[PDB]
Amino acid sequence: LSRNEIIQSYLSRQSSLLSSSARQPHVLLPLPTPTDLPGLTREVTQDDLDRIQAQQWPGVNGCEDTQGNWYDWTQCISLDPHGDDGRLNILPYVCLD
Amino acid sequence: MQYIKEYTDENIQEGLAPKPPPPIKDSYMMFGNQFQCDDLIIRPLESQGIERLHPMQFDHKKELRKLNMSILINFLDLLDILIRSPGSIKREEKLEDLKLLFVHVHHLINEYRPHQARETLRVMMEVQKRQRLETAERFQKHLERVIEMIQNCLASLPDDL
Amino acid sequence: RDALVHARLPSFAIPYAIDVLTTGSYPRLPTCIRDKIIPPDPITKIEKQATLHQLNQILRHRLVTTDLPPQLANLTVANGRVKFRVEGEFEATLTVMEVPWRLLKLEILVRALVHSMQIDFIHQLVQSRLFADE
Amino acid sequence: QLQKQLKEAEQILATAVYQAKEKLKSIEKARKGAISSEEIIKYAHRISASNAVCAPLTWVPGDPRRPYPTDLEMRSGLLGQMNN
Amino acid sequence: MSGVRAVRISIESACEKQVQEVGLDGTETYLQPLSMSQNLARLAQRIDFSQG
Amino acid sequence: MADRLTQLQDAVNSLADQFCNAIGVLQQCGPPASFANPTEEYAQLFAALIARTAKDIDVLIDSLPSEESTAALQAASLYKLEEENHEAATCLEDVVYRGDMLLEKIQSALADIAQSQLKTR
Amino acid sequence: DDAGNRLRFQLELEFVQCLANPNYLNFLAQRGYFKDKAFVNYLKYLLYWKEPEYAKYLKYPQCLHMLELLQYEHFRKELVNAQCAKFIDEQQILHWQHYSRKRVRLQQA
């Protein structure tokens, strides 16, 4: 934060893009009531999986959005969840790296 | 790529002269320089002992992002204050307190939370096998093609005239 | 800016447990170096017996796929080879290396005692006839 | 005609059975083979000192991450000086 | 977590992706198909008891 | 990555330093006055990347995993899933074995027929 | 018996895991480090020492690969080039985590 240049700015931008990452509608997935800890104190069953995979619930699979934005547990759909105009093949909802 | 004299002396033998086989360590041991520490701490406490970046809203990640934004705003305010009133000498002391927050930052944003979700994905792993079983179901459908071969048997009856 | 990443805590080292903990080799790695350095291993396992059974089945199929065995009215099903016939004159031999096969090498088995040991010219002509594949 | 039909059917069934056997061998290698939790925990506890088995941020295939702990600690360390 | 759980998961590894070209940011390619019929044919082509 | 180990403080400090450098290049040193394309492109790229990264981080934090997937719960779920996958694999293997036995019987009958046809000629 | 659990185990789990992998083994095998017959026999008789519990501070990894190179004469005579061995080790060590790098690269563009 003391000495900054064009190379330093490029390195900071690359580090930020590596660490943190026309409609671009962000699906504001709200805390689902069907969980396991402070949810319904129940184990993982077919009901919770079907509610998180078909309905808009970010329990296990993920809360699907409009415009065919199917966000399942391992669905790498080409959506536009980012803040840019690139609707490329985004990673899965889990994105386990 | 080296010559370990102890292991070579303990391994070079023909018959029962050699020592026991090299097994794995499931408990505390004194294997050379490595301490062989078992049960490494991974899950730390949030509100018990240090400051908690996760509110009671059950959203730890969103609360942590809000806390990071607030920390950035407070850093900007402290920089503006130092530019306006530079007589503060205890501000750096707060950085030491950040060390405590650094403990929480030890699980801040990068590469530790998804593993927990991977637990659920573990079940999905077997589901992936079920997907393969789905392809294996096609093999069962291949049995239906055997009936087609049975039709060839009928074709063996019609070709005889 | 620095101590958050340089002096942080790494992951559980899942990569080594996923790559090397399976077997003491380089499965999750490039096998090109070991192939260019070390040659293949002996494939004469029970897999070789399975391949021999598959070759025998392919030969049983080619027996009906090829011409009739009326040549000399004598033949046999050689396991992994081509046994021509019997009775010395049309003596069988070893002819080995879908995809129909062809006789590679022959052997004549019918005076002095030491008759002959070189089939060189005859073997070359047999190979030429096999490569003709008419 | 019956022999050709049976041969084609047997070839199809053999291809199906070969695919099934390959899938079964893959499933067996996936199920019977697993990683030890204690071993990974010990590797993480003993690897968090140097860059030996730790995954960096810009760690792609062929990146600066290597299997050795350090250059002086392995080539010129106890293996090169004490153990030669 | 801990890189492994105390359960029997089913995850098959694709070790066919032998690194042969130095690509950008890794991204290996699995090329070996491992066809059982093709593998048997290749094995019998060279290892079929040629001597006896 | 939807994980949380060591990126928050680093990303925040990097964004603060980038904003400070942008403000400096905009107000202190530059072709504003005297009392180019590369710097402007770098500043625009940095601002766009910071905005997109903040939006994506907020979205991933809202969509991150909840307190679910506990120890015993995940253990029991993985055990049940492994049992189900093993049962499915056993059924598929039995079906494949039946099919392979049928194919082997057909091949044996065909080989016997071919041997009889060759012996009859 | 008694001394084996404190001498062999102390020199086995920390022997064949991490340190002297093929990154710098091309220059260590051509000059001569374990090319001897007795050392090769000892390494072959002690090939079960590559446990993952101590996969960070070892003596010399890849015991089976070293045995195969010594059997096929691929360590002391062949593969003595440093560039090929270094590239192989670099593509072998950071390969199990290249999935995260590929995912980040795909999410970037």
From Swiss-Prot, chain A:
Localisation: Nucleus
Coiled-coil residue spans: none
Family: Belongs to the Mediator complex subunit 26 family.
Role this protein plays: Component of the Mediator complex, a coactivator involved in the regulated transcription of nearly all RNA polymerase II-dependent genes. Mediator functions as a bridge to convey information from gene-specific regulatory proteins to the basal RNA polymerase II transcription machinery. Mediator is recruited to promoters by direct interactions with regulatory proteins and serves as a scaffold for the assembly of a functional pre-initiation complex with RNA polymerase II and the general transcription factors.
Oligomeric and partner information: Component of the Mediator complex, which is composed of MED1, MED4, MED6, MED7, MED8, MED9, MED10, MED11, MED12, MED13, MED13L, MED14, MED15, MED16, MED17, MED18, MED19, MED20, MED21, MED22, MED23, MED24, MED25, MED26, MED27, MED29, MED30, MED31, CCNC, CDK8 and CDC2L6/CDK11. The MED12, MED13, CCNC and CDK8 subunits form a distinct module termed the CDK8 module. Mediator containing the CDK8 module is less active than Mediator lacking this module in supporting transcriptional activation.
The protein, known as: Mediator of RNA polymerase II transcription subunit 26
Gene source species: Mus musculus
Lineage of origin: Eukaryota, Metazoa, Chordata, Craniata, Vertebrata
Gene this chain is encoded by: Med26
Parent-protein residues present: 468 to 588 of 588
From Swiss-Prot, chain B:
GO biological processes: positive regulation of transcription elongation by RNA polymerase II; positive regulation of transcription initiation by RNA polymerase II; protein ubiquitination; regulation of transcription by RNA polymerase II; RNA polymerase II preinitiation complex assembly; somatic stem cell population maintenance
Presence of keyword Repeat: no
Compartments (UniProt record): Nucleus
Main subcellular localisation: nucleus
Keyword check for Mitochondrion: no
Keywords tagged on the record: Activator, Isopeptide bond, Nucleus, Phosphoprotein, Transcription, Transcription regulation, Ubl conjugation
Gene Ontology MF annotations: transcription coregulator activity; ubiquitin protein ligase activity
Top-rank taxon, per record: Eukaryota
Gene Ontology CC terms: core mediator complex; mediator complex; nuclear body; nucleoplasm; nucleus; transcription regulator complex; ubiquitin ligase complex
Quaternary assembly: Component of the Mediator complex, which is composed of MED1, MED4, MED6, MED7, MED8, MED9, MED10, MED11, MED12, MED13, MED13L, MED14, MED15, MED16, MED17, MED18, MED19, MED20, MED21, MED22, MED23, MED24, MED25, MED26, MED27, MED29, MED30, MED31, CCNC, CDK8 and CDC2L6/CDK11. The MED12, MED13, CCNC and CDK8 subunits form a distinct module termed the CDK8 module. Mediator containing the CDK8 module is less active than Mediator lacking this module in supporting transcriptional activation.
Family that this chain belongs to: Belongs to the Mediator complex subunit 7 family.
Protein name stated in the entry: Mediator of RNA polymerase II transcription subunit 7
Swiss-Prot record, chain C:
Subcellular location(s) per record: Nucleus
Entry superkingdom: Eukaryota
Family per similarity comment: Belongs to the Mediator complex subunit 14 family.
Function recorded in the entry: Component of the Mediator complex, a coactivator involved in the regulated transcription of nearly all RNA polymerase II-dependent genes. Mediator functions as a bridge to convey information from gene-specific regulatory proteins to the basal RNA polymerase II transcription machinery. Mediator is recruited to promoters by direct interactions with regulatory proteins and serves as a scaffold for the assembly of a functional preinitiation complex with RNA polymerase II and the general transcription factors.
Quaternary structure and interacting proteins, as annotated: Component of the Mediator complex, which is composed of MED1, MED4, MED6, MED7, MED8, MED9, MED10, MED11, MED12, MED13, MED13L, MED14, MED15, MED16, MED17, MED18, MED19, MED20, MED21, MED22, MED23, MED24, MED25, MED26, MED27, MED29, MED30, MED31, CCNC, CDK8 and CDC2L6/CDK11. The MED12, MED13, CCNC and CDK8 subunits form a distinct module termed the CDK8 module. Mediator containing the CDK8 module is less active than Mediator lacking this module in supporting transcriptional activation.
Protein name per Swiss-Prot or TrEMBL: Mediator of RNA polymerase II transcription subunit 14
Organism, as annotated: Mus musculus (Mouse)
Parent-protein start and end of this portion: 147 to 292 of 1459
UniProtKB/Swiss-Prot annotation, chain F:
GO molecular function: transcription coactivator activity; ubiquitin protein ligase activity
Family the entry assigns: Belongs to the Mediator complex subunit 21 family.
Compartments, as annotated in UniProt: Nucleus
Annotated function: Component of the Mediator complex, a coactivator involved in the regulated transcription of nearly all RNA polymerase II-dependent genes. Mediator functions as a bridge to convey information from gene-specific regulatory proteins to the basal RNA polymerase II transcription machinery. Mediator is recruited to promoters by direct interactions with regulatory proteins and serves as a scaffold for the assembly of a functional preinitiation complex with RNA polymerase II and the general transcription factors.
Origin organism lineage: Eukaryota, Metazoa, Chordata, Craniata, Vertebrata
Tissue specificity annotation: Expressed in brain, heart, kidney, liver, lung, skeletal muscles, spleen and testis.
SUPFAM superfamilies linked: Mediator hinge subcomplex-like (SSF140718)
Annotated GO biological process: blastocyst development; positive regulation of transcription by RNA polymerase II; positive regulation of transcription elongation by RNA polymerase II; positive regulation of transcription initiation by RNA polymerase II; protein ubiquitination; RNA polymerase II preinitiation complex assembly; somatic stem cell population maintenance; transcription by RNA polymerase II
Record GO cellular component, one term: ubiquitin ligase complex
Gene: Med21
Chief location bin: nucleus
Organism: Mus musculus
Pfam families documented for this protein: Med21
